Design a protein around this ligand. Structure first.
Ligand SMILES: *Cc1cc2c(nc3c(=O)[nH]c(=O)nc-3n2C[C@H](O)[C@H](O)[C@H](O)COP(=O)(O)OP(=O)(O)OC[C@H]2O[C@@H](n3cnc4c(N)ncnc43)[C@H](O)[C@@H]2O)c(*)c1C
Ligand SMILES: *[C@@H]1O[C@H](CO)[C@@H](O[C@@H]2O[C@H](CO)[C@@H](O[C@@H]3O[C@H](CO)[C@@H](O)[C@H](O)[C@@H]3O)[C@H](O)[C@H]2NC(C)=O)[C@H](O)[C@H]1NC(C)=O
Length: 475
């Protein structure tokens, strides 16, 4: 069957990786080493036509098919979340092209750092995206794309124009608001479930020349954390849009860190109200170029990431997309966390990232259709949320994997217990792997689910493009 496929692929001269070869062992290695899988075949296209033929060779052999770009799926859904998929690795298609009207064409395999590197050097242009340079553009944008430029310039999908996409029947479409309003609407948030994208289009913004990263180091106690976090909610509503912030919380201390697109002295005035509530001061702050800021937050990884790519970790993570927590909700989180922090025996191999996500001064909250003053056509449901939580654990998962799952869930639940069941969601790019399809799609996609399920039945009724937390077609 792996050879039933592999033969079809080479009948259409779709480049494929030979089974159980040296390259097959290097390509089947997931990013998250905790979850590995074994394709039925791996395709390695370099043209849109390869993808189309590869998708047709998938329909022929009744295999589910799944696309992998960067491979940073927290559950290795690039491979399909299971064995026996045809896996179309678009990593080799990474050409960036900057047009004169400031739109760009980015092939579906480009990694974020290769996108910023080529956009700043082809002109001085950029799109908003996350901090990790090795992340693939396809998975990042089709589900959101948040980083230290988002509060100022929006999610990556907010700048999304359209994409050449291969539907389950092999037909190649260019999807944009005019020609395919609903398909493009699904691609802005949940496009992993609807086709194999080969090229994405975005409207770039001018890479700023004056950018100030900053950190504020802290060591809260439980009650200094109920106050400090409540003070940050208020600041998330009022701070200028030039300001981008998150707070790392770990087992031994905290660090408020972010980026202000402006001068140091202006950052000082923006932070004054929050630092007053906190009783804290900037620890490190420096002004420099835009590529400098992306390198400072790349976590040691060189920006211009390309193929071949061999980064790996073994971890479990989850997220939250909350509104402003109440006093008592922040107290439940800090009681449960410092309960863990002060316990010498408990699992301490975790950390938490709380981005300031929405509010009146965030560009995500009222993102618009490009070149318009009308709302954006996007299935992404969380523009009304204020805070983007991420819970991670990078400890042991061979022998004590269920301790890793318990501790992050105990943290996440401590936040949501008192919250109205439909006032909080979760973030698909930070997908919680332990979730039932019903729960996951409820939380990632919210009130877009029915329209998404209606559209899934239109386009992929046999559910070829399958993954554990994918959109299921309506019966
Ligand atoms: C590993 C990692 C992930 C990060 C990091 N930093 C982030 C940040 O600062 N902000 C964020 O908002 N997210 C951050 N993420 C998470 C990434 O955004 C997500 O993990 C991306 O979804 C991963 O994308 P990619 O690198 O392409 O991973 P894949 O496993 O290849 O794909 C995931 C998902 O997308 C589908 N898909 C991929 N390629 C296609 C194409 N061409 N067409 C359709 N669908 C595609 C896959 O099927 C799968 O469902 C920091 C780090 C270190
Ligand atoms: C592969 O599948 C896609 C999606 O299932 C097919 O595209 C869809 O095709 C229909 C008809 O060709 C398009 O027309 C739509 O339906 C009504 C029917 O009355 C038509 O009058 C309208 O023009 C309306 O647009 C539809 O738009 C189109 N959808 C998409 C997303 O492309 C495609 O035809 C299939 N490929 C092959 C080779 O059959």
């Amino acid at each position: 069957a792996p050879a039933a496929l592999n033969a079809c692929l080479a009948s259409k001269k779709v480049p494929y990786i030979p089974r159980d070869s040296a390259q097959w062992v290097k390509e089947v290695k997931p990013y998250n080493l905790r979850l590995a899988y074994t394709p039925a075949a791996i395709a390695l296209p370099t043209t849109v036509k390869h993808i189309s033929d590869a998708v047709k060779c998938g329909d022929q052999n009744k295999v589910r098919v799944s696309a992998k770009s960067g491979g940073h799926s927290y559950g290795s859904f690039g491979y399909g979340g299971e064995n026996g998929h045809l896996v179309i690795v678009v990593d080799a298609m990474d050409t960036v092209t900057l047009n004169k009207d400031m739109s760009c064409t980015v092939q579906a395999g480009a990694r974020l750092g290769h996108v910023a590197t080529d956009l700043f050097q082809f002109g001085k242009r950029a799109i908003p995206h996350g901090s990790c340079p090795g992340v693939g553009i396809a998975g990042h944008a089709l589900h959101g794309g948040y980083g230290f430029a988002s509060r100022t310039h929006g999610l990556t999908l907010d700048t999304f124009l359209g994409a050449t996409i291969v539907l389950t029947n092999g037909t190649i479409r260019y999807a944009a608001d005019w020609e395919y309003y609903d398909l493009t609407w699904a691609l802005r948030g949940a496009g992993s479930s609807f086709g194999i994208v080969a090229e994405l289009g975005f409207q770039t913004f001018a890479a700023p020349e004056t950018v100030t990263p900053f950190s504020i180091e802290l060591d809260w106690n439980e009650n200094e954390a109920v106050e400090g976090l409540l003070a940050m909610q208020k600041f998330a509503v009022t701070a200028p849009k030039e300001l981008n912030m998150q707070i790392y919380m770990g087992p031994s201390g905290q660090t408020i860190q972010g980026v202000y697109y402006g001068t140091r002295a202006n950052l000082n005035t923006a932070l004054r109200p929050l630092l007053g509530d906190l009783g804290a001061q900037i620890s490190t702050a420096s002004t420099g170029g835009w590529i400098q800021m992306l390198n400072k937050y790349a976590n040691g990884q060189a920006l211009d990431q390309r193929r071949p790519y061999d980064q790996h970790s073994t971890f479990y993570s989850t997220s939250l997309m909350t509104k402003a927590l109440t006093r008592n909700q922040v107290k439940s989180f800090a009681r449960t966390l410092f309960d863990n922090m002060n316990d010498s025996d408990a699992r301490h191999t975790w950390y938490i990232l709380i981005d300031l996500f929405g509010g009146p001064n965030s560009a995500v909250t009222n993102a618009k259709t490009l070149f318009t003053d009308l709302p954006i056509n996007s299935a992404f449901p969380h523009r009304d949320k204020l805070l983007l939580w991420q819970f991670s654990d990078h400890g042991n998962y061979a022998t004590h994997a269920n301790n890793g799952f318990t501790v992050l869930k105990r943290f996440r639940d401590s936040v949501t217990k008192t919250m109205a069941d439909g006032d909080w969601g979760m973030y698909a790019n930070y997908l919680d792997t332990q979730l039932s399809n019903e729960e996951a799609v409820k939380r990632y996609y919210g009130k877009s689910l029915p329209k998404l399920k209606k559209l899934k039945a239109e386009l992929d009724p046999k559910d070829m493009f399958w993954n554990p937390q994918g959109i299921r077609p309506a019966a």
